[PDB]
């Protein structure tokens, strides 16, 4: 009958792992909690609010490199931040779908101001710092979203033979599956950082 | 009572725009088609197969730069391909969620072999060509997925004031919204291409 933040978020993350993001509804959560829906409303007004709370919790638990570390290079900060963000998105079933569209709350503002102060002090324009961080965020989401979906689709589709593909495509696809999700993420992340370096050197 | 590819895919893309990807089911489609479900089964065995057909159709209609164009530079090919892919993902409601996890069929193999032949003839290793294309694909998906979700979330959440944010975050967020989806996509795409150039120059 009684709720608080921690009770509602712990039950919701277990439900997310049991049923996935489409399966998750405020009604199913109230039931798992053994509470009536109007008690739950004061804590999560709707699905959207629930998703946002769950995305923030996953970052609070697993996003260890949210903020720059003294005395990291900007390149190491961007790589570590992306890796940490990725770990948060992979922490739960459909975690990156949970994260899409999330807004910062006031408790992240200090962190997010420090990221920008740090990059601009490294020589980035404000605009270039914003889009370096945006590009890292969009590439990391895309990466995890595509990974997480192939995983789901395999219960649902005939598993494809590569035998009949033409030679370069066969070799590329077999190599992409062989090396797996983390090497593809690290290769793209490195290409982004190299591009940021090139653009920064110009500018100044 | 009668089906063929075009009838089923046209009705399904209109239903996608009416109800979005979660709203789309094979049963609701059979109803819109005025057909019984076993007739539909021979054309789409389940949701997964339906999604895959819809993702391929959106590329067949809107992905104009699927293949390299003679005599494009590799940088122009990668930029144009990404822009064309983006247009396909934006063509319908939830289009990028439709595209997640899609597998090529045999009719794309020629196209996809030509992309790789083209990049390796430009001096890429097979591995580096594969992950340049992967990184462009993941960044573009991420970009569109995040855009498409903020759009949805606005019917569902109090629209946030930036007034109380600290000065760099306030300026960055206001600038990201001001310039909009396409400039953020183009900035990330350009950073990727610059990074590819840097890595290619090394190598050889």
């Amino acid at each position: 009958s009684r709720l608080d933040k921690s009770k509602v978020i712990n039950s919701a993350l277990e439900l997310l792992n049991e049923v996935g993001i489409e399966g998750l509804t405020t009604r199913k959560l109230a039931q798992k909690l053994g509470v009536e829906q109007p008690t739950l409303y004061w804590h999560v007004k709707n699905k959207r609010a629930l998703l946002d709370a769950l995305a923030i919790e996953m970052l609070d638990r697993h996003h260890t490199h949210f903020s720059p570390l003294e005395g990291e290079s900007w390149q190491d900060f961007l790589r570590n931040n992306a890796k940490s963000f990725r770990n948060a998105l992979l922490s739960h079933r459909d975690g990156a779908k949970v994260h899409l569209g999330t807004r910062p709350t006031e408790k992240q503002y200090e962190t997010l101001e420090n990221q920008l102060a740090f990059l601009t002090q490294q020589g980035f324009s404000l605009e270039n710092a914003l889009y370096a961080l945006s590009a890292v965020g969009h590439f990391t989401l895309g990466s995890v979203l595509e990974d997480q979906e192939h995983q789901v689709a395999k219960e649902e589709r005939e598993t494809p033979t590569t035998d009949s593909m033409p030679p370069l495509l066969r070799q590329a696809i077999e190599l992409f599956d062989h090396q797996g999700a983390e090497p593809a993420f690290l290769h793209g992340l490195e290409s982004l950082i190299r591009g940021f370096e090139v653009q920064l050197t110009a500018l100044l | 009572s009668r089906l063929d590819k075009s009838k089923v895919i046209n009705s399904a893309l209109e239903l996608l725009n009416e109800v979005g990807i979660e709203g789309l089911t094979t049963r609701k489609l059979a109803q819109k088609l005025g057909v019984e479900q076993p007739t539909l089964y021979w054309h789409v065995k389940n949701k997964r197969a339906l999604l895959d057909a819809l993702a391929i159709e959106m590329l067949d209609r809107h992905h104009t730069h699927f293949s390299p164009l003679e005599g494009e530079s590799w940088q122009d090919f990668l930029r144009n391909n990404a822009k064309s892919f983006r247009n396909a993902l934006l063509s319908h409601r939830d289009g990028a969620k439709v595209h997640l996890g899609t597998r090529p069929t045999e009719k794309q193999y020629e196209t996809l072999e030509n992309q790789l032949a083209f990049l390796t003839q430009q001096g890429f290793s097979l591995e580096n060509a594969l992950y340049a294309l992967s990184a462009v694909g993941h960044f573009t998906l991420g970009s569109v997925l995040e855009d498409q979700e903020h759009q949805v979330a606005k019917e569902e959440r109090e629209t946030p004031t930036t007034d109380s944010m600290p000065p760099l975050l306030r300026q960055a967020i206001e600038l990201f919204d001001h310039q909009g989806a396409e400039p953020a996509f183009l900035h990330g795409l350009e950073s990727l291409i610059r990074g590819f150039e840097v890595q290619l120059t090394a190598l050889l």
């Binding site: 970052l59 996003h63 | 629209t159 946030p160 004031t161 007034d163 967020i173 919204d177 909009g180 989806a181």
Partner: peptide
């Protein structure tokens, strides 16, 4: 409030 935005970058 004076200013609102309708699109945000990913949070991380």
């Amino acid at each position: 409030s004076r200013v609102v935005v309708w699109r945000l970058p990913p949070l991380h």
